Amino acid sequence: VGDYQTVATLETFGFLPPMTQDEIYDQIAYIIAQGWSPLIEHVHPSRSMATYWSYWKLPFFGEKDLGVIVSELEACHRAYPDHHVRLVGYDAYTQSQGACFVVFEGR
C-alpha cells in the first residue's frame, strides 16, 4: 500500500530528517575521538555532482573543541545560506574521508 517517491538525497543521512544540534555535537565528538580532522564544504545544490566542493578555512589539525567547530559551521552557513553545507572528517593515515554528512541544506 502506497509508493515510495524518488527523493534527491544527500549522501549518507540524506534520507533522515535534518540532524539536531546535539546530534551534530555527538558527530563532531566522534570525529575527535577517531583522531580525524573536521573540514567544512559548501557548494551550490545545482553542482552536487561535482567531485570537489568549495572548502571553508583550512582543516583544523590538533583542534579538539566542539564549540569552535559549531561556530565555524554557523558562520559558513550564514556565508552561503543557499548552498549545501556538509562536514567531513579527514583521516591523514589512510587518505580517505572517515565520515561525512550534510549539516545544512540550501533553500
Partner: protein, 445 residues
C-alpha cells in the same frame, strides 16, 4: 627417511623466505617429524632412490625447510607444521606458480591421512612483485565518493531467465532505492535466453538513468568470466566503452591466470574489479582437510581485486567469527600481528599495498545488519538479493529500507553506542520514519 635433510631442528626462517603452515595428519604411529619432512620435500624435491642430476645443482640451497612442529589445540594426531621456502622457488608475481609449488603434488602422497594448508607468510619482495589490486580501498571510495557507511549491494533475483530489458529494469529498480551496486549471478555470463551484449547495454542505460535520477555515482557489477580470455577482454572493453565503472569475475572458476590478467587490464584501463568466491567451499567446506579460505583470500589479494565474498559468519551459524574477523584483518590491514585464535600464524606485513573490500552476502536481511556492521567495520559491502527483492513493496522499497537501516546503525555506532544489544530499539527508531523498514522487520522477526 627424509628428516635428515628436510627437517631442521634449529633453523630460523629468513625474512625473504615463503613460510607455509600445514595441519598434517600422517598414518597412525608414524614419526611426525618424518611426515612433516616428507610434506616439505614433496613440495620441492622427491626421489625414490639414489639420483645423479641433483649433484649438478645445489639441492642444499634450493630446498624447503620445515622448522617447527606444534601440537594442534584439539587433536594430538593433527599437528601444525611450518615449512620454509627459498624466494627463488617461485615466479616474480605469479600466484598460480605459488599454488602449483605449494599444493601441486603434496596432496597425493599416501603417507598422509589428511593435509590442510592453513597460513602463508608472503615475503615483502614477492608482494612488491605482484601487480596487486588495480584500485584499492581508498581509491575505490574516491572513485565512488562514498564514505561514512559500508556499501549496499544485491544479487539480481531470480538466478536467471531475464531478458536484457527485464534485467536492466530490475537493476534500475534495485539501484534507484539508494543501493550502491548490484552483482550479476556468478553462473550467468552469456545464455541462449540472454546474450551478454544486450544485458550490458541495457544495464548501462539503466545505471545511467538511475545515476541521473538519484544524484549519486552508481554502478552495477558486470561479469566477464567466459569461455576464452579473448571474450573476457572483449566484454571488459565493451563495458569500459559504456562508461560502467566496475566489472566482476569468478577467479577460481575462470582461473588465477585469468584473474591476474583481468586485474592488470583493469589497472591499465582504470576499472574496478569485483570477485565472487564460487567453488571456494569445495576447497574449504571440510574443516579438517583442504585449503583454508584465508589462503585463498591472500592469493586473491596478491593477484589483484577490489572485493571478495565472505558471508559474515552469522545469520545461520554463530560459528567461530574470530577466524573470520582474522581473514578480514588480512584483507584490509597492511600489517596483522599473530593471533592463534584468529588463525594468523605469522607476522604478515603488506607494506603499503592497498587492501580489498569484504563482501557479505547470503542468508542475510535487515534483522542482521547491526551485528554485520559491528563485525565487518566500515570497509565492507552488504548484499540482500532475496531480502530486497522479496520485500512486498518492491525492490526499490526494500533497498531503501536496508539503506536507512544501515544509515541509522552507523549513526548509532558513531554515537558511541553498543549496537548489538539495543539493535531492536535502533530498528524501531529507524522504522519511526520508514514504514517499509517497519514491514520488512515485521516479515522476518
Amino acid at each position: 627417511e627424509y628428516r635428515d635433510t628436510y627437517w631442521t631442528p634449529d633453523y630460523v626462517p629468513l625474512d625473504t623466505d615463503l613460510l607455509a603452515c600445514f595441519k598434517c595428519t600422517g598414518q597412525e604411529g608414524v614419526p611426525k617429524e618424518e611426515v612433516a619432512a616428507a610434506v616439505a620435500a614433496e613440495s620441492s624435491t622427491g626421489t625414490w632412490s639414489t639420483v645423479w642430476s641433483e649433484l649438478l645443482v645445489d639441492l642444499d640451497f634450493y630446498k624447503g625447510r620445515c622448522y617447527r612442529i606444534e601440537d594442534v589445540p584439539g587433536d594430538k594426531e593433527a599437528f601444525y607444521a611450518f615449512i620454509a621456502y627459498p624466494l627463488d622457488l617461485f615466479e616474480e608475481g605469479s600466484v598460480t606458480n605459488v599454488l602449483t609449488s605449494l599444493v601441486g603434488n603434496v596432496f597425493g602422497f599416501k603417507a598422509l591421512r589428511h593435509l590442510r594448508l592453513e597460513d602463508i607468510r608472503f615475503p615483502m619482495a614477492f608482494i612488491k612483485t605482484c601487480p596487486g589490486p588495480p584500485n584499492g580501498i581508498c581509491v575505490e571510495r574516491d572513485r565512488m565518493n562514498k564514505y561514512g557507511r559500508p556499501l549496499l549491494g544485491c544479487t539480481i533475483k531470480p538466478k536467471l531467465g531475464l531478458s536484457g530489458k527485464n534485467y536492466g529494469r530490475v537493476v534500475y529498480e534495485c539501484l534507484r532505492g539508494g543501493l550502491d551496486f548490484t552483482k550479476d549471478d556468478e553462473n550467468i555470463n552469456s545464455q541462449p535466453f540472454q546474450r551478454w551484449q544486450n544485458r550490458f547495454e541495457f544495464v548501462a542505460e539503466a545505471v545511467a538513468l538511475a545515476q541521473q535520477e538519484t544524484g549519486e555515482k552508481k554502478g552495477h557489477y558486470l561479469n566477464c568470466t567466459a569461455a576464452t580470455p579473448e571474450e573476457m577482454y572483449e566484454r571488459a572493453e565493451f563495458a569500459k566503452e559504456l562508461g560502467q565503472p566496475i566489472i566482476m569475475h569468478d577467479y577460481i572458476t575462470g582461473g588465477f591466470t585469468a584473474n591476474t590478467g583481468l586485474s592488470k587490464w583493469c589497472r591499465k584501463n582504470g576499472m574496478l574489479l569485483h570477485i565472487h568466491r564460487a567453488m571456494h567451499a569445495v576447497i574449504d567446506r571440510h574443516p579438517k582437510h583442504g585449503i583454508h579460505f584465508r589462503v585463498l583470500a591472500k592469493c586473491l589479494r596478491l593477484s589483484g581485486g577490489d572485493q571478495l565474498h565472505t558471508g559474515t559468519v552469522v545469520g545461520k551459524l554463530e560459528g567461530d567469527r574470530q577466524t573470520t574477523l582474522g581473514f578480514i584483518d588480512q584483507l584490509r590491514e597492511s600489517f596483522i600481528p599473530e593471533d592463534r585464535s584468529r588463525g594468523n600464524f605469522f607476522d604478515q606485513d603488506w607494506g603499503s599495498m592497498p587492501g580489498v573490500f569484504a563482501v557479505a552476502s547470503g542468508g542475510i536481511h535487515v534483522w542482521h545488519m547491526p551485528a554485520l556492521v559491528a563485525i565487518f567495520g566500515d570497509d565492507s559491502v552488504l548484499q540482500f538479493g532475496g531480502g530486497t527483492h522479496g520485500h512486498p513493496w518492491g525492490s526499490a522499497a526494500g533497498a531503501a529500507a536496508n539503506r536507512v537501516a544501515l544509515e541509522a546503525c552507523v549513526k548509532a555506532r558513531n554515537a558511541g553506542r553498543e549496537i548489538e544489544k539495543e539493535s531492536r530499539d535502533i530498528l524501531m527508531e529507524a522504522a519511526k520514519h520508514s514504514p517499509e523498514l517497519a514491514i520488512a522487520l515485521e516479515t522476518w522477526k
